[PDB]
Design a protein around this nucleic acid. Structure first.
Ligand SMILES: [Mg+2]
Ligand SMILES: [Mg+2]
Ligand SMILES: [Mg+2]
Ligand SMILES: [Mg+2]
Ligand SMILES: [Mg+2]
Ligand SMILES: [Mg+2]
Ligand SMILES: [Mg+2]
Ligand SMILES: [Mg+2]
Ligand SMILES: [Mg+2]
Ligand SMILES: [Mg+2]
Ligand SMILES: [Mg+2]
Ligand SMILES: [Mg+2]
Ligand SMILES: [Mg+2]
Ligand SMILES: [Mg+2]
Ligand SMILES: [Mg+2]
Ligand SMILES: [Mg+2]
Ligand SMILES: [Mg+2]
Ligand SMILES: [Mg+2]
Ligand SMILES: [Mg+2]
Ligand SMILES: [Mg+2]
Ligand SMILES: [Mg+2]
Ligand SMILES: [Mg+2]
Ligand SMILES: [Mg+2]
Ligand SMILES: [Mg+2]
Ligand SMILES: [Mg+2]
Ligand SMILES: [Mg+2]
Ligand SMILES: [Mg+2]
Ligand SMILES: [Mg+2]
Ligand SMILES: [Mg+2]
Ligand SMILES: [Mg+2]
Lengths: 155, 122, 260, 188
RNA sequence: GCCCGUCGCUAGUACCGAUUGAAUGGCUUAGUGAGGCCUCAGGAUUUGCUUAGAGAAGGGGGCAACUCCAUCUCAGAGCGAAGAAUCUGGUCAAACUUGGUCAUUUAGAGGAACUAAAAGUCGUAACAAGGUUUCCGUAGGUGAACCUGCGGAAGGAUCAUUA
RNA sequence: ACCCACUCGGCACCUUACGAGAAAUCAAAGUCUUUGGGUUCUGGGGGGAGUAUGGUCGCAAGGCUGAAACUUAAAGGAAUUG
RNA sequence: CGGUAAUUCCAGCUCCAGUAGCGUAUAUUAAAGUUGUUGCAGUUAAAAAGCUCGUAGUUGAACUUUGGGUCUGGUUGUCCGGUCGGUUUUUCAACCGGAUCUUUCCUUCUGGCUAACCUGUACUCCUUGUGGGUGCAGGCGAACCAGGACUUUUACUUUGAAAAAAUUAGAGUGUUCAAAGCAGGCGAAAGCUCGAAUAUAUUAGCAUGGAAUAAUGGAAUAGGACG
RNA sequence: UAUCUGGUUGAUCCUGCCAGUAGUCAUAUGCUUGUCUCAAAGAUUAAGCCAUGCAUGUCUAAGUAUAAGCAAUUUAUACAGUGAAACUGCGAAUGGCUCAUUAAAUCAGUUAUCGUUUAUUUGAUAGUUCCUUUACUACAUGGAUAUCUGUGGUAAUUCUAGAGCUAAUACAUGCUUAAAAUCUCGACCCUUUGGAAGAGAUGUAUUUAUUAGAUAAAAAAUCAAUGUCUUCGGACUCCUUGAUGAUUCAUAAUAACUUUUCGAAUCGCAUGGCCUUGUGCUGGCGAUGGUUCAUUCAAAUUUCUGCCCUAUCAACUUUCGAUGGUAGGAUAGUGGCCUACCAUGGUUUCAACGGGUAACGGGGAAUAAGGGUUCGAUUCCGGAGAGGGAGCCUGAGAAACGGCUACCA
């Protein structure tokens, strides 16, 4: 979400230490470097076919996914390239021997490879500290459509 | 700061103070087996109760499975060596019924009297 | 606080010293070296509590100063050197060489080893990496780095080490059906065969390891140390030999064996 | 002094986190160098783990580099020509990473006169074959050629001159070169 | 018999309360800003290398640019290196100043309570259909209980009038 | 429009309670120490007090919300005989 | 309780309780099912909002793979001790698995090793034999890997790995007994020699089995599934 | 080792509370007190104040010695035995105490650093300093400064100013050094199949670039560049590559720089081996140092989940970074850690925010059927603090306080 412009800051952003040789004359021009992420996660072609740079993407960046591979649905999407994943869970309380439905929203960076909307479930890997709160990175929008192509009643 | 050398207030009072029949029954014990204090009795009663407490927490589990079998046997082994428990009874469920009177008759107090030597107990 | 810690308080003393609760506020902090704090064994514990060649720390200190003590070829005068797992401690007066190996319980043991075999030290990996001048080099979890290893000495695979010279005698690969000694907490100092290696992406490689008695158990790879192929382990192990009996089984062997 | 604490920053929600401990050394972040171009000077600093981490101060010169050829030289700087973070660093003329700058280009010529020897802006018998075998390899992207004639190429330094001490950078070529030129015409 | 209130005395608990109250601390406007660190300079002093002329009694192995030696050694002067106080911006920011503000404390004239009571006045409200049945809600009034409207309830003084 | 029998819906009585319940009584106030169908709410001796305060709501009356300090050995409930 | 016999005040003798201790004060835990998850009350004793709506919450009907066989591993009681108070089978048992076959897939392949004979290429070392194996073209793959492909996701529960030590429970042991402690034990008493356990800690994460329970999900514009 | 009694009544059964009852490595006190083992002990109130003394310093065969010190006697015609003093080294960031803060903070387990520093630790290791190559410091470069010699001050102080000498593992400079191979330069000949005499540069650190760091299998047609062997039809064949789940990783190259780091003008014991018979060239056992890689001790962050009371706190954060982004700046490093420009996010009744806490977290403690409650200042592990609040030097490690600077008290 934003989006599209590729090169549109005061600066002009390249994938650092990666080159698009002017002497050489390939069809792509831009050598789109990309990362195989591991942990059984497939590299989505929207990253490798696409345009955007992003430092903070796992695929098109130096961001290395590790550690806790959390999940949960997506509540908030409004900000630039990040998401807020709502990781619901229970909390056991022995003096009762029952459960609290607890909440914690997890802010998590989006590589624009994926299309993320509200009410979508999403696996998401811990990585470097991206930002203040965002220590996490969208890796797999599981509800890619979630009845998006199909509403639609009248035969 | 070597380490706190642990201890126990080992021997612990009953939960009322004046059950008349207990006050007599404790006197009877301190008279028969010659005990200077109530303490000497509660000492045995607790020391015993600790065993009982094991036996209950073993008999809750199935004797055939491990701890029940092992700790129970070792608990019995311990008692038969100390000589409270009979050689007729080595069945754990018999440990449960051991009583304070059987413990006292095993003390060096009494085993003087039971082997003669002293005469008249005290 | 404000940087690294210099003391080590006796209750915090890692349990497999079998350090005494009383008789000292402190424990000997194992100094910096090839083996991790808790996985090491400082020589004071070794020479005093274990072997009793010294009656106190003073005598250990002097014992190290006169200097027949030689941990892994070199001498040491350090009262708390990290003499960890596999570390060949040779006392030339008495000729009582000791390899450092775990008793089935977990606590280390005195193994009164030969002249003779106490001469190589088995050692793990760790790395495989390369350094400058493009030199490929291998590292042992159990301390040392050895240069120019055979290309197919891979990771979590053992290596026999010449020790006195410090090179490579030979190596044992890591794979299915290979005698493996254990160095992890609950399964610590058991021995077994290896059946599976659960790969696991990120969250630790597991290994399913049946003993002689064929009681299965699992550990992590890091806590596993390939002692050989089945039948012939490369090290002479203590009485018990990595079996780890049941509680009643140990009680049985004790109260059966009464030879006054 | 100028610390890098997560302690301050109120919080993720707002909760003004109370000042737990007096800020520590390991959290620190020293005064910004913002090195100029006016008489070569450097001071070092004793950082974490000892480490002499040279702070450049009024740094003149830095080895700015080609792409097509793959070369760099003892190359003089002229001035801070455009800085895409903050224009404050343009007028004060404070050199910084990813700042577009102008390169004396005489060393880029003198060495180019050997490499190919075709000249940019507008002997010996066996060399003439090495001269002939080389050359007509790189034609160069127009702006760089005119800037070669200007004596003022457009680099974009990529050292961190408060960390490094060295002010070594990179000649702009191709797309990024074509981009930063549009911003230089926008700023001017 | 029980008992309810007004009004009295004797103690104490809290309450409010003018105080332009007071304190302590926490935050906090504006102004100042100690001191270091970085930074712009600044150069007390210390010296190397320059062949820079000595007196020097072999100032390199026998009158002589010593068969001139790190030669006797200062006027050189040039070139450095290190380098104090001092000092131009920054920056961190104690603290003060003079306010503003939350929290907790704490004097406070006065008021208005509430509770214990030895036991006193004034009645005697309620409990018996308590001598106008009690109640509740809610208005008004009184010397106090209380009373009186309206509506309600019986915890009513009635589980009852048939055609 | 009745009679009579049975039925879904409504409003209440009689007897035994073997079931509840402190009992009065209750076919629910039963299926609860043989303790668990689901859910919301309220109470924790009496007073002080539905007061003080602070909200908040009201034209106001007042409401909603709601204290402790202090005080006291009983306050009750139901029934038994007088 | 105390107004001249006060068994409660105050003193002597008795006596009780505890005993080198016992009282007192404040907390606090128990008792308190007087805070209640287990486990309380609410017609009248305190307590059901005057009523209805109502978002969050919490809760929420039933329904999808059941049953039968066929072998095959154990594990204690039995049947004698077949034995030098212990051990090895059968006549038998229940109990817990495992493999399967039942309209039935347990995730599927691209290949490595195809262990094995479903074999039959020469047919026989050989009691009259289908007792027995030197043996290799088609080829049963579960005997393991090592890489894809893509997993409906949870809760739930399992055993596992981890949850520093002391503490806690607890095994061993003559600190004289214990409270404890990590000691100790036995020789010619010239040297040798056992130990220094085990368990717990269940909250979260990680591991693997299980698929009832509970939720969740899939093909109804089939843009569905396969080839 | 699941336990109840007295109390409202004329008496009854309840609701109910009070009262008892037992225990507290739970405080206090009141009596009383013979012994044995063991043994907490200024936390609670004032994280209030502190006389005095002490609690951190350290030398070996082995860094620096004409103490006008001690030795003293059968190595010193530069030194060698002991050694005050001092510089250098290292240590003083450990331990110890305490609990004021502090309520998603700390802290516990759990991960992670592919996101970093790490003296020490024990493992590893640098022919390339030279810069034209017919006469050059290398068998050893320089002058300082201390302790000292005195010259002194002061009312005080672990205050030290001047001169004279005097060192170093202190501080500066600074030599050798090949062979090969690879990359930039080059007297011509002979019309192609084109091919070379010979000159310069190339350690390690540093900096940015740029390329390699590969890998799902077999077989072609021929268009531009046109190479090897031609047994002059044409053949072309044997053509390189670590680790992880995962990289812009390890590592290797091309290009350079750089107020050009490092590459021993260091030290104690041992006195061997060849004679080209010089005092020649040679060589043992050690010490420290020194480079990045390792490891250890650690270190900073950081993942997940988890706190006591309060709605008589329902909104809070966002001017003065709140949430995100792009870029820089800084840092050891990640980052709203800081700065610019931009977007308007972020949390919340699954209690945000606020307040309270006679709150340091955890391990644990007491109680003790089960479920629990309350306590944890306090022997271990974390975290904080050293009257407050700041700021910093040195150092691997300090925002140190038995360091310093300041302001308040
Ligand atoms: Mg400390
Ligand atoms: Mg990892
Ligand atoms: Mg200032
Ligand atoms: Mg009337
Ligand atoms: Mg009346
Ligand atoms: Mg009346
Ligand atoms: Mg009350
Ligand atoms: Mg209680
Ligand atoms: Mg109740
Ligand atoms: Mg009522
Ligand atoms: Mg259902
Ligand atoms: Mg115990
Ligand atoms: Mg109970
Ligand atoms: Mg009454
Ligand atoms: Mg009475
Ligand atoms: Mg009580
Ligand atoms: Mg010396
Ligand atoms: Mg590449
Ligand atoms: Mg790299
Ligand atoms: Mg380093
Ligand atoms: Mg950045
Ligand atoms: Mg506190
Ligand atoms: Mg607490
Ligand atoms: Mg604590
Ligand atoms: Mg306190
Ligand atoms: Mg501590
Ligand atoms: Mg103080
Ligand atoms: Mg300080
Ligand atoms: Mg200190
Ligand atoms: Mg101090």
């Amino acid at each position: 979400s934003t989006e599209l412009t590729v090169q549109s800051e005061r600066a002009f952003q390249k994938q650092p230490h990666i080159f698009t040789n002017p002497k050489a004359k390939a069809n792509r021009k831009t050598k789109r470097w990309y990362k195989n992420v591991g942990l059984g996660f497939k590299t989505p072609k929207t990253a490798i076919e696409g345009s955007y740079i992003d430092k903070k993407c796992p695929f098109t960046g130096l961001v290395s996914i590790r550690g806790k591979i959390l999940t949960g649905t997506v509540v908030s999407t409004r900000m630039h390239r990040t998401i807020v994943i709502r990781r619901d869970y229970l909390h056991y309380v022995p003096k009762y021997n029952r459960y609290e439905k607890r909440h914690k929203n997890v802010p998590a960076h989006v590589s624009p490879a994926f299309r993320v909307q509200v009410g979508d479930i999403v696996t998401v890997g811990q990585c470097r500290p991206i930002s203040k709160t965002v220590r996490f990175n969208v890796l797999k929008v599981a509800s890619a459509t979630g009845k998006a192509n199909k509403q639609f009643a009248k035969f | 700061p070597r380490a706190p050398r642990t201890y126990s207030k080992t021997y612990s009072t009953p939960k009322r103070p004046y059950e008349s029949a207990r006050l007599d029954a404790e006197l009877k014990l301190a008279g028969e087996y010659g005990l200077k204090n109530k303490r000497e009795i509660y000492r045995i009663s607790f020391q015993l109760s600790k065993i009982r407490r094991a036996a209950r927490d073993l008999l809750t589990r199935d004797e055939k499975d491990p701890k029940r079998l092992f700790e129970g046997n070792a608990l019995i082994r311990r008692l038969v060596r100390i000589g409270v428990l009979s050689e007729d009874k080595k069945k754990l469920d018999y440990v449960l019924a051991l009583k304070v009177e059987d413990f006292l008759e095993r003390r060096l107090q009494t085993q003087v009297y039971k082997l003669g030597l002293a005469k008249s107990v005290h | 606080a404000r940087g690294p810690k210099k003391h080590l308080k006796r209750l915090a003393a890692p349990h497999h010293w079998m350090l005494d609760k009383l008789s000292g506020c402190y424990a000997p902090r194992p100094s910096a070296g090839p083996h991790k704090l808790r996985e090491s064994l400082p020589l004071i514990v070794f020479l005093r509590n274990r072997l009793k060649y010294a009656l106190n720390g003073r005598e250990v200190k002097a014992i190290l100063m006169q200097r027949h003590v030689k941990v892994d070829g070199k001498v040491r005068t350090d009262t708390t050197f990290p003499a960890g797992f596999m570390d060949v401690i040779t006392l030339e007066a008495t000729n009582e060489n000791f390899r450092l190996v775990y008793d089935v319980k977990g606590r280390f043991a005195v193994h009164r080893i030969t002249d003779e075999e106490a001469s190589y030290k088995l050692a793990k990996v760790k790395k495989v990496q390369l350094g400058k001048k493009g030199i490929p080099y291998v590292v042992t979890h159990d301390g040392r780095t050895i240069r120019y290893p055979d290309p197919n000495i891979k990771v979590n695979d053992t290596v026999k080490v010449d020790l006195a010279t410090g090179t490579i005698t030979d190596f044992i690969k890591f794979d299915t059906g290979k005698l493996v000694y254990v160095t992890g907490g609950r399964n610590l100092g058991r021995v077994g065969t290896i059946v599976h290696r659960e790969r696991h992406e990120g969250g630790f490689d597991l290994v399913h390891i049946k003993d002689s008695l064929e009681n299965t158990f699992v550990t992590r790879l890091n806590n596993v140390f390939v002692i050989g192929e089945p039948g012939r382990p490369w090290i002479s192990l203590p009485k018990g030999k990595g079996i780890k009996l049941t509680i009643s089984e140990e009680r049985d062997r004790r109260r059966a064996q009464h030879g006054l | 002094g100028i610390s890098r604490d997560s302690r301050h920053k109120r919080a993720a929600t707002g909760a003004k986190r109370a000042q737990f401990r007096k800020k520590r050394k390991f959290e620190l972040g020293r005064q910004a160098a913002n090195t100029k171009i006016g008489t070569k000077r450097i001071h070092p600093v004793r950082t974490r783990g000892g480490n002499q981490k040279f702070r450049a101060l009024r740094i003149e010169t830095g080895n700015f580099s080609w792409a097509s050829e793959g070369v760099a030289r003892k190359t003089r700087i002229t001035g801070v020509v455009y800085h895409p973070s903050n224009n404050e660093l343009v007028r004060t003329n404070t050199l910084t990473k990813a700042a577009i700058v102008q390169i004396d280009a005489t060393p880029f010529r003198q060495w180019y006169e050997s490499h190919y020897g075709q000249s940019l802006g507008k002997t010996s018998k066996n060399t003439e074959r090495k001269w002939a075998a080389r050359a007509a390899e790189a034609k160069i992207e127009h702006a760089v050629d005119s800037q070669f004639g200007a004596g003022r190429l457009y680099a974009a330094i990529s050292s961190r001159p408060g960390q490094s001490g060295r002010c070594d950078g990179y000649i702009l070529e191709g797309e990024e070169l074509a981009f930063y030129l549009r911003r230089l015409t926008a700023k001017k």
